[PDB]
Amino acid sequence: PEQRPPLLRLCCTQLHQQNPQCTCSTLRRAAMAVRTRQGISASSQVQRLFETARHLPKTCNFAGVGVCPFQAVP
């Protein structure tokens, strides 16, 4: 299928409710929330969690943002 997974589209719609210069900060907050609420601790899972969050503007075609910069994982 050429259309994206429905959940990804819902995420992109939520991201579009924010200004570009808020997107990376809020995605970092969202990643921290997932990591702690779900107890994600395995190193590769934690790294992939934060990477996925930082790439979401680009996964969503939020062209004014690109990929969010790396910040040390807690």
Partner: protein, 35 residues
């Protein structure tokens, strides 16, 4: 920048956007596929 500019409030935008709930679910789904 001025007192009557757009003045984005990122934490308020986050809560208004349902804390990016669908993004959180997506992030979680991708994370557990690692390796």
């Amino acid at each position: 920048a001025g007192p009557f500019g757009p003045r984005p409030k990122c934490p308020s935008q986050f809560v208004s956007a349902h804390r990016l709930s669908a993004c959180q679910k997506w992030i979680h789904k991708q994370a557990t596929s690692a390796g």
